[PDB]
Design a protein around this ligand. Sequence first.
Ligand SMILES: *[C@@H]1O[C@H](CO)[C@@H](O[C@@H]2O[C@H](CO)[C@@H](O)[C@H](O)[C@H]2NC(C)=O)[C@H](O)[C@H]1NC(C)=O
Ligand SMILES: *[C@@H]1O[C@H](CO)[C@@H](O[C@@H]2O[C@H](CO)[C@@H](O)[C@H](O)[C@H]2NC(C)=O)[C@H](O)[C@H]1NC(C)=O
Lengths: 23, 23
Amino acid sequence: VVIGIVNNTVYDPLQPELDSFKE
Amino acid sequence: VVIGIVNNTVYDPLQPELDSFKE
Ligand SMILES: *[C@@H]1O[C@H](CO)[C@@H](O[C@@H]2O[C@H](CO)[C@@H](O)[C@H](O)[C@H]2NC(C)=O)[C@H](O)[C@H]1NC(C)=O
Ligand SMILES: *[C@@H]1O[C@H](CO)[C@@H](O[C@@H]2O[C@H](CO)[C@@H](O)[C@H](O)[C@H]2NC(C)=O)[C@H](O)[C@H]1NC(C)=O
């Protein structure tokens, strides 16, 4: 819908912190 | 770098809630 959007990635602080420990 | 800084602790709401359950 937005003119000029770009691809990138957004960091998720929760996922590594709570997947390394929960493993 | 800051003049007047003090020592203290900052509560982490995530750590107890998600380490007691993940144990
Ligand atoms: C990155 O951006 C490109 C375009 O800027 C996206 O490419 C489109 O992707 C859809 C779905 O895969 C296709 O139907 C279009 O034909 C693609 N267009 C072009 C110009 O390539 C792409 O989806 C974005 N994301 C990624 C991960 O590549
Ligand atoms: C609490 O504050 C004191 C100073 O206000 C800090 O003490 C310094 O600690 C560093 C690293 O351990 C030393 O190199 C300095 O010599 C210490 N200075 C003094 C005046 O003690 C201390 O790091 C802070 N944190 C804790 C947990 O004590």
